[PDB]
Symmetry: none
Subunit: 157 residues, 3 copies
């Protein structure tokens, strides 16, 4: 039994450029609503999406054959660190932050993960606040309720 985890995030192409990302979490597929482009994946690109303006997210149910190859998600956000494509992600007092100079237009849609490989949030954008850059994200509390958090003067990515 060879367990090779496959990509669960996919670049959204626009004018031949990576304008953001989509990902599959909990049998669903998500993409930031403010981000335009075509998912670099035929199968997923064809799926019709329901829109949730409140969360700047569009989503669709992933095909049956993919139901088992998606990110698991959790509400557990103890203060400490997590990871995302660019590296270390800090979580403290309800805000996710990354190092100054990391993160810019194009990262919208990237997931944030705990050490157990579980998704704790999806990035929508950010803003530099001194030595750190605070992120705008979609998260989830214990009840499964989706919550969107956006920092002061945030910039959509």
């Amino acid at each position: 039994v060879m367990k090779l985890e496959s990509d669960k995030t996919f670049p959204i192409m626009l004018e031949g450029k990576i304008n953001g990302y989509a990902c599959v979490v909990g049998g669903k597929l998500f993409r930031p609503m403010h981000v335009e482009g075509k998912i670099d994946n035929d199968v997923l690109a064809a799926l019709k999406t329901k829109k949730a303006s409140k969360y700047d997210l569009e989503y669709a149910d992933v095909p049956q054959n993919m139901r088992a190859d998606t990110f698991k998600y959790t509400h557990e956000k103890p203060q400490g660190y997590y990871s995302w494509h660019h590296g270390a992600v800090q979580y403290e007092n309800g805000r996710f932050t990354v190092p100054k100079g990391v993160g810019a237009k194009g990262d919208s849609g990237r997931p944030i993960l705990d050490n157990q490989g579980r998704v704790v949030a999806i990035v929508l954008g950010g803003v530099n606040e001194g030595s750190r850059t605070a992120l705008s994200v979609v998260m989830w509390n214990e009840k499964g309720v989706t919550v969107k958090y956006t920092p002061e003067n945030c910039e959509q990515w």
Copy 2:
């Protein structure tokens, strides 16, 4: 357990039981006047309501943080079928009907929706007329004017 859609109808409690429902439509919260009890949502339960005896409806503007996530309504009511918590609702000859045995005390305030998810009416009560049971409701016409219809010998739910 991911919840992407917000609730739009909320039960009204009275002595531990559900006595009726309130719902958010067009940025406003509606509640049947004849129904007493506390809305099971602290923010909505505290809003000061404006009364309109004629329509047996109480209402108040929803706080902006919820204005966007409320039902869309319409005056379009072509003869045919609609839906509500209990199932198929028929609309013919200017009145809504449901099968016998469906609809009772506790259903006042529930909305009836069209296939596009828009609210066409709010239930205030009903009366059995044989194989079918006729509903009392408040609807909306062209001018956006609220209109109330009550079958013969109706009884408030």
Copy 3:
């Protein structure tokens, strides 16, 4: 048996190789072209970017006719299409002047003919050339090792 690794054709040349290991088809992600086998060439692959690989579950009527792999990498000699390979310090090495563009995808086997790693690239380090590979540990976990300044093949 005998054909478990196939060439990946591009513009008429062999840009690399694909192989079936443990009921799965493997193909380097940085290698473009079509597998030299309609059956494998027809399967839809999933991307495994962290490992620079693309794979697909081979059909059932084939799972038994594919390479058998192992995590067992005891210091010693191994083999591949170009000859001897040495495993020492969690690193696979080949003699200098051996291995280059077109080898990505080739498997390395133990004395029992079991795959122990798939070649992704390599970088010369004097008399020996260090290989970048994809392998497995004592837990069935797929791993990717890449030497410094490793050029893709």
